[PDB]
Each structure stands twice: as C-alpha cells, then as structure tokens.
Amino acid sequence: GRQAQISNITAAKAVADVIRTCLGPKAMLKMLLDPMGGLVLTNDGHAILREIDVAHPAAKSMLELSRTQDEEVGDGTTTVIILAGEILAQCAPYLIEKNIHPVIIIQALKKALTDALEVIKQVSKPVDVENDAAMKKLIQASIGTKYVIHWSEKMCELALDAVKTVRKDLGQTVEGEPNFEIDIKRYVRVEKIPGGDVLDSRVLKGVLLNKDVVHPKMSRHIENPRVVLLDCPLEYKIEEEQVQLMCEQILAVRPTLVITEKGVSDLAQHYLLKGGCSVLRRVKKSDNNRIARVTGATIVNRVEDLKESDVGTNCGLFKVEMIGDEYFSFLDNCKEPKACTIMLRGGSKDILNEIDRNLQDAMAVARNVMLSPSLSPGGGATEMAVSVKLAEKAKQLEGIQQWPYQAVADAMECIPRTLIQNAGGDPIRLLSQLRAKHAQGNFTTGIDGDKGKIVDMVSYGIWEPEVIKQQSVKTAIESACLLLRVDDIVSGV
Amino acid sequence: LRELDIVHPAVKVLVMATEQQKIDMGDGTNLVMILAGELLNVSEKLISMGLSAVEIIQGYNMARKFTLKEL
Amino acid sequence: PKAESLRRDAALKVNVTSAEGLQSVLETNLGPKGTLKMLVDGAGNIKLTKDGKVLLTEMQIQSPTAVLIARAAAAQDEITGDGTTTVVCLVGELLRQAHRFIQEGVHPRIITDGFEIARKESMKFLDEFKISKTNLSNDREFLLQVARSSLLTKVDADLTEVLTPIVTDAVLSVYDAQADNLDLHMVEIMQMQHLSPKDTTFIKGLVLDHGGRHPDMPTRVKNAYVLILNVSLEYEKTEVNS
Amino acid sequence: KGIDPMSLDVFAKHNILALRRAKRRNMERLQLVTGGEAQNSVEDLSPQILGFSGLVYQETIGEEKFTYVTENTDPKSCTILIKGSTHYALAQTKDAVRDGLRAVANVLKDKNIIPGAGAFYIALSRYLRSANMNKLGAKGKTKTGIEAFAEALLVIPKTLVKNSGFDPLDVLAMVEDELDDAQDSDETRYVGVDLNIGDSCDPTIEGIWDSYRVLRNAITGATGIASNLLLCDELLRAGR
Amino acid sequence: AEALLVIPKTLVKNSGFDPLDVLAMVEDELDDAQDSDETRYVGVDLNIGD
C-alpha cells in the first residue's frame, strides 16, 4: 500500500542525514562507531557510505548509484544524494495529501531536467582549453588542502601534458565527433617509480620497465635497439638445437634487442650473446599491448611466424643508468606514440602513494574541463541561479505538472543553504538577499566560504566545469524517480 | 598473609610492605602492619576536616627525618 | 510528511561531559604536588604511575570520545616524549568553555577557525618568550634544576635528590659534545627488587646477570684486562647421549 | 659458554676472574667500552687485543651476582640501575627515569628552553587577550571564540594549586598584580606559581624549565584534537 | 557586566537576527565614537538588525 512509498522517502532521508554537513569544502569530520571498537575520523563523504550498514532496501540503491559517480568523477558524490533527497521531502505532501499520481511527478522531473540543462548551458562561460595558467585555478579544487599544495606548480605540467597528448579532435559529421576524444583508462594509467625528485618529474611517452640486464657482461649503450615481441618464451618445447632454432628465427632480421614475456633460460642467453642483442625477461601481459603501439612490432605467438615488418624506430635512449639504487629502462622519445607514461618520482613510497590518488583525481577534473569547454559558478551560485529560472517557467506551463515542478525550486536552494549552515550565519536572512542578487547581477553573486558574507565570484574567480553540474542534476533525477517507481516491497527468496 | 587470599589491592600494599619486614630483618612484621593501619585512622580526621592529602604526605616526610635522627 | 531539519547539539553535550569525566582522572595526576593513582587491569601486578599515556593504555574504554584523546598521547610520546597529561587537560577544559557558546549559537567551524588564528599569533609571542641555551659544557649546574622538573612529578620528591646526580651524569658521560646525535637505547636498564630505591647508584659500565661463582675469587680487582673468549672451556659430549 | 670444574682450581691460584653464561647482546657493546676485539681463536690472539678496564668488584648476594665493568677512560656507554623494595616501586621508578631521559634529550637537540610552573600559560593567556583588542584586525565574531582559548590556558596554574587545597583565585590575582608592574618598566621579569610557599616566584632562580619542542606541539596538538571532537554532529553507529 | 548583556541578546533572539552580529557592531561603533570626540548613543534596532 502507501506504507512502502513512505519508507522509500524515509530511507532516502536517512542516507542523506549523515552527509547533510558533509557538503562543501567546509565539511566537518564524522565519527563512525564500529562494533569492534574502531573509529573512522575521515571527512570523505563516499568513503564513509561504504561502511554504513543499512536496513531498508532503497538505501542500498543509493550506495550503488553513489559508487558509479565516484568512479567517473572524484567530487559531487554527496551533491547528488542531497539534491535527490530533498526532492522527496518537498514532494512528500504532494504524493500523500494532494493525492498526485507518481508518474506525473516522475514525468514532471523529466521535463524539469530538460529545462534545467538549458539553464546550465546559458549560465556557462567560455574557457580556453589550451591555456596552461587557466587550468591552475581549476584543478586546484582537488589540489589544495593536500600535501601536493607545495608542488602544485609542478603538478599542473604533469596533468596537462598527459591529456593534450592522447586527445584527438577528428571533427566531422560522418562517423560522429568525440570532442577531444580522451582515454583515461589505458593511456593515462600511471605507474609509481620509487626514488627521484618531484620538481624534476617529467611526462614520459612510451613504455617503462624496471627490469635490469640478465647478463653480467653486456653493452650498456645501444644506438637503435629494435623491440621484438613474442609469446612463447625461449626453452625446450635436440634440446640444445631446439632453443637455438627458436633464436635463429628471430636473428633472421638480426635484431639488436630481444624482449621476452616470460623468463629466459641460461641456454638461450649464450646463443643471443653473439648476435649483439640484449635479452629482457619478466614482462607483463597487460603491457604487451602498449609496447606494440609505441613500437609497431606485431605480436606473434609462434616464433617461426614472426613477421619482418617490425621496426625499432622512435626509440629515445638505451641508457641503463641506475636511478634510486635500481636499474631502469627508458623508452621515451621526442614523438607522441599515441600514448604516454607518467613517471612519478619522490623521496619515499608513502609520498608517491598519496600523489598517485591525488594525480588521478586531478586529471579527472582536468578532463572535465576538456570535455565541456565551459565553466559554471561554484559555491551554490549555480544551484540558486537555476531555481530563479524555475519560478518564471512555472507560470507558463498551465497544467497539473505545475505543482510538482514548483517543488523542484525548493530543492535547488538546499545546496546553497547547506553551505550557509556550515558558515554559521542566518540561513533565512542570506537566502532572501541572495535570491534577489541573481536577477540584476547576471548570476555573478556567489557565497564565500572563508568569510561567510555574500559576495560576487568575479573577484575570487571560483569556477567549476559544466559536465559535473550536468551529471549531478541528471543522476539526481534518475535517483529520485527510481525511488518512486517502487510502490511495494516484498521479502523472501 | 601468604595463606590468605587478598581481594582488595589496597590491602596488598600493606601485605607487600609486611613481606619486606620478613625478608630483610625477619622481625617486626606486627609493628609494620599495626602502625601503618593507625596512620590511616588519624589521617581520616584530617581529610574530613578539609586538610588536603598533599600536605599530609609531606608532613610524614618531615616527621620521619626527625624520628630517625633521635634513634 | 513532517519536513523538520531538527535541532542538533545533542550527543556531544554528553561527549563534553564524557571529556570532563576523563579530565578529572588526569587532573589530579598532573604536577609534582598531584596524586598518584593505581591502575591494575587483569594482570595482578600493582603499578602506580602518573603518565597520561600509560593510564589510557591500561584501561579499556568503550566511549568513542576518549579514543581520540588516547591517540593524541601516542603522537606526543613518539615525537616530544612529554606533556602527555598536559595535552589531555587542555582538550577537556577547552570543551567546557566552548560548550557554553553552543547555546548562544556560535558555529563550531568558527570555533576551529578561531583556534588557528590564535595559534599563528601565539608563534610570534613564542619566539620572543623563548630563551636560547648555549651548547657549552658548563651548563651541568643548570641541567640539575631542569632534570628535577620531570623527576619531582612522578615521585614523592624524596627520591629526586638521589636520582639527581644519576640522571644528569648519564647523558653527559655517554655523549661527548659534538653535533652527532643521541640514542637512549645504548643506555641499559637493570631491574632488581632486592635493595631499597634509596641506595641506588649510577653505573658507568655494563652489568651482567650470571657471573662466575668460586670461593677463592678476589673481592676487588684494579686495572683488569677484558678479553673476549669464544671457545668452550667446558667439556663437550657427542650429540647423542654417551 | 660454561665453565668446567677442572678450571676452577686453576684460575684460583692466578686470581683470574672467570665468567659464564654471558648475554649475546651485552657482549656486542663490550667492544666499544673496553676496546678489545672478540677473539675467536687463541692461536691468532694478539697482545693488542687486550683492552683496558678499571676496578672490577663483584657484589655478594646469594641469589645473583653482579660484575662491574665501570670506571673506564672512554666507556662511551652508561647503565641505569633501578632498585626498589616492592614491585610497584620498580615500575614507578622506571617510568620516572625514562621520562627524565627524554626531557633532557630535547635540551641538547633544541637550544630553546621555556620556564614551567605555569609561567608560559599565564603569560600567553594574558598576551593573546590584549593583542586582539588593540589591533582589532581579525573579526568581531571570531574574537568571541578566541576568548575561550585564552581562558582555557589558565587551567594549568589553577590545577597545580587545586590538588594542594590552595585557592586558585587567590594565586591568580597575585600573578596578575606582578605582571602589571612589569609592563610599565622596560625590563624583563618572569613570574611563576610557587606551590610550596603559595606566592609567586622567579622561574629562573627556582630552576623550573620545560622543553620547547614539547610545549610547541602541545598547543598545536591539543588544537586539532579538541577541534575534531566538536566537528562530529552525529555519532554514527553502523557495521552490524 | 555579562549579566546585563542578556537583555539586548533577548530582544534580538525573538526577532530571529543573529545576536552575535549585533553585539560586534555595537562594540565596534562605540570605539570609533570615542576617538571622534563626540557623543553618539547606540541602540539595538530589532526590525533591521543593525
């Protein structure tokens, strides 16, 4: 009956009850009491939600939707739940007392979501994606209040070089146009390298391997080594000739470098020693796909089927010089092989482990500006500016959907009210004056976190990309409507 | 005291002080336990009177040095 | 229905009271004139100490409030190595004055922001108030008064006069005066329950547990040569009993 | 290693002190104190291997016996012998010695020293109160919470006199009266609480001093701990 | 002295305005009036809040 619809709103309010004060850079710290006697003092919103034990089944749905948004973007996780949670609060008397059909409310949120995205596109401002100084104040949102605040000047050069290298316009109307066509997963994958310095860290383009030379006496300088990839290693599949026969098939082109995926026996090391080629074993399978793209040697299973089309061109240096008490290998060159490898150097492993997660979240926000070449005002300015446009479009609808459409404007003002509750001022006094400043102020009036007095954002210059604001309101409607789709809950296998 | 099971640890302090008399000098164990028990009775009136136990402990250190010099 | 956004500042009011309960435990335990409390949990071993870190590790506290205070004593001991009780007294008392401002409407973030402003301003007065001490070796007379500060706290002040020359001469003897560094692990600690604590003395060398027992050994040997001998001077037998 | 009964009569005629059952960790430090290198074979023994030591005498106790390597020219080592009658006397003394070594350790590392007995807390609480009132450069609402921080620093001098039964308000007014005369003159005079007499005292003459590194991290450390306690609005019970 | 400041805080509390902001504006205004060498009386306005 109607009891299950009430429990859906109550479960959504209980999940958002914890993150009420967790929204914004001023979010405070929470204490989670574990049954084993442990506590978690971290203020991270999405990190606490995974340890929260919930009863009502709709609470688990909010955890799965927050996990998906956490992987795509680093921030805005608690923004979606609070925005979607306040919609059910304003629509609670409309669904019960007013006896409004739930699909009408769901259909009204679908039409309001389309009008909300149009307002976001109007309030957006153009931004230069090629400006290196403009990206400093943007990515800084994921930089400041962290250990990387001192090296932030050097961290900006590491993120911009990785995104601009793997992006391809390829604009046309034939097959469809990806904007900059960025791939974070395969190309931007970062491998931590111990030792070195953070200031001298540079962006390498190629494949890097930490394995050393497997032979005691070998030339440490090779002019142009040619990468040769193979699947089956060198070993017994006569036993001495079988290993030599597999080597003669590779030596047909007389390569100066040999790279083996698996280990290499000592019998094959003596045959390849006279050929003037280095032997490299212990190569992972996942990295074999990236080596073929930075080299061009065709991956072949059987050695006898190895093609002669392989080339060792675009190889920067063979230098094996020891760095950090470990022999490295640098394949980086002066050209872009449709990929890059970010080498993070530092003074310890604990520093590199913190820069790892921080750099991945910094580049995720960096792509957010690259995908959508527009910025939206932060600090509750975007959430309040949309609510102003909702009151004007509500008068021209002239239908039954007008009542649930006006309830959206009340939920849009909860995000800027959240920052005021953490500011310490009067929420009613500030929201009344802030709403009137957007009409004649061209939505340039935001909220200052440090001070707490309402001021314009033209001075401080606080801006956030549009794709975060678009995915925040798009997921919130999908999360709020999904909770209204289930009107009954049953138990049992 | 070795055959008796002491529960409250406050009594164990007097039992451990009694064993010190038996190990070294071997005599006077009755003088140590009885005298230490009376010092708490005369100090009960000082605590109830409002005198802090800090000056009570400091007073015994001054009275102990005056007694050892007269022996 | 019933859109509320209810009135908070429940909870912590009890945690502030829970902080006052833990504060009173370490309140009388601070200072040389304080009281010495006995804490024995399950080990049947009587132990009396005023150290704030030791008191918290010997008790199992289910209240989550004292858990963070317990972690503060571990950070000060591994770095500063002192002031374990003083920090606890400052955290509990600060919550008392900050709790009265809760009913007034003072926001807790500004309370935290007001502490960072006072902390930065305290560093300016801290640089002028501090006094630099010279590295000269004539400060041994001045080190006697400094060493008594930590000693008078944990004892009845009668033992401090005995341990005053021991603690002072312990650091200067092992460590010659240079840049170098200091290591407290090189100083051995021997525990003996026989003699009284008033008769203790300082040991410049090293002491061992099991010594040789022979009736004709001399009592005192002056200017003796020490020679390490690794060979067995006792008869040996086959691995199998024979 | 052990000693056979045959060598007992041999070492007695030459008055050679013999030892057995030596700790392995203790013998590693004997090379630094004595100077002699460990000799694995007597056939390779050299006359320069013999070290130098002072008077060596063994205490006579039925249960155990001790050996004193003490009185050396350059021992470069020390040993703190803890004695006590009871079990709790050994734990209390061990805690007082380890607390004293770490307090003196900060004197050689850090050349800065601060006087104790509440001299720093009273002077800091009075300075921070009159500093913001003259400048007025922070905020009107922020200075409300700053007053709570200044009043929280005066609990230490009030706690020292509370255990002894002294009036914390009486000793507080006596210190403030002496600080008013020091602000008029251009000289520098430190005031502190004397627990024995009950009046004020000069911490330089009395000799009460506290480490700089300990007190520097005490204010900053207690700031973050006391702040995080007020940042949690709701106790979160989950996981089961 | 602190017991006499509850009356201006009680009047503003019923109006809804923050009693902490009105307390700071009055104390800051009285300090500037002494240095200006004049006599200006200050009071709590419940409607506006200043």
Side-chain angles (χ1 to χ4, degrees), chain A residues 291-484:
Chain A
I291 295 171
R293 294 182 181 175
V294 299
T295 58
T298 299
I299 295 171
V300 177
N301 290 336
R302 184 180 65 195
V303 177
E304 294 177 350
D305 290 344
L306 177 63
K307 294 177 179 177
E308 295 177 351
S309 63
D310 56 351
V311 295
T313 59
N314 291 337
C315 183
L317 58 82
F318 181 78
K319 184 185 292 179
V320 297
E321 183 178 2
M322 177 178 71
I323 294 170
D325 291 344
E326 184 178 2
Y327 296 140
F328 294 159
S329 296
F330 295 159
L331 295 176
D332 179 67
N333 56 33
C334 296
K335 294 177 179 177
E336 295 177 350
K338 294 177 179 178
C340 56
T341 299
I342 294 171
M343 176 178 71
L344 295 175
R345 291 175 295 181
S348 64
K349 294 177 179 177
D350 290 344
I351 295 171
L352 296 175
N353 190 30
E354 183 67 15
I355 295 171
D356 187 5
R357 182 178 181 171
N358 289 336
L359 179 63
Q360 294 178 336
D361 290 344
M363 295 183 287
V365 177
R367 181 179 180 172
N368 290 336
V369 177
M370 298 300 292
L371 294 174
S372 178
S374 63
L375 296 175
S376 296
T382 300
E383 297 300 320
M384 182 65 73
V386 176
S387 63
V388 176
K389 302 299 183 181
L390 296 175
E392 294 178 351
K393 294 181 181 297
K395 294 177 179 177
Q396 295 300 321
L397 178 62
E398 294 177 351
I400 189 65
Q401 294 177 336
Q402 185 174 355
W403 289 272
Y405 177 78
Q406 293 177 336
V408 177
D410 290 344
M412 295 299 293
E413 294 177 351
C414 295
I415 303 301
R417 182 178 181 171
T418 299
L419 296 175
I420 295 171
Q421 294 178 336
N422 290 336
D426 187 4
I428 296 170
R429 181 177 64 84
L430 295 176
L431 293 174
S432 178
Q433 294 178 336
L434 178 63
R435 182 181 64 196
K437 301 299 182 181
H438 293 82
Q440 63 180 19
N442 193 30
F443 56 86
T444 58
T445 300
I447 295 171
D448 187 4
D450 290 344
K451 293 177 179 177
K453 294 177 179 177
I454 295 171
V455 295
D456 291 344
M457 295 296 103
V458 177
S459 296
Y460 296 140
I462 295 170
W463 292 93
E464 294 178 351
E466 183 178 2
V467 63
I468 294 172
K469 301 299 183 181
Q470 293 177 336
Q471 294 177 336
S472 178
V473 296
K474 183 173 178 290
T475 301
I477 301 301
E478 294 178 351
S479 178
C481 295
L482 178 63
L483 296 175
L484 295 175

Side-chain angles (χ1 to χ4, degrees), chain B residues 13 16-17 20 24 52-55 58, chain D residues 85-88 162-166 196:
Chain B
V13 176
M16 292 176 70
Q20 184 176 355
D24 290 344
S52 296
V54 177
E55 294 177 351
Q58 185 63 59
Chain D
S85 296
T86 59
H87 298 290
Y88 62 89
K162 183 178 179 180
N163 291 337
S164 178
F166 295 159
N196 291 283

Side-chain angles (χ1 to χ4, degrees), chain A residues 17-18 21 28-35 48 51-53 423-425 453, chain D residues 139 141-142 224-225 227-240:
Chain A
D17 179 66
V18 177
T21 59
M28 295 183 286
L29 276 66
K30 300 299 183 181
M31 183 177 284
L32 176 62
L33 177 62
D34 290 344
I48 296 171
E51 296 301 321
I52 301 301
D53 186 4
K453 294 177 179 177
Chain D
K139 181 61 174 172
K141 184 178 179 180
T142 300
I225 301 301
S227 296
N228 291 336
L229 294 174
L230 295 175
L231 297 175
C232 182
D233 292 345
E234 182 178 2
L235 178 62
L236 297 175
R237 181 179 180 273
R240 181 177 181 171

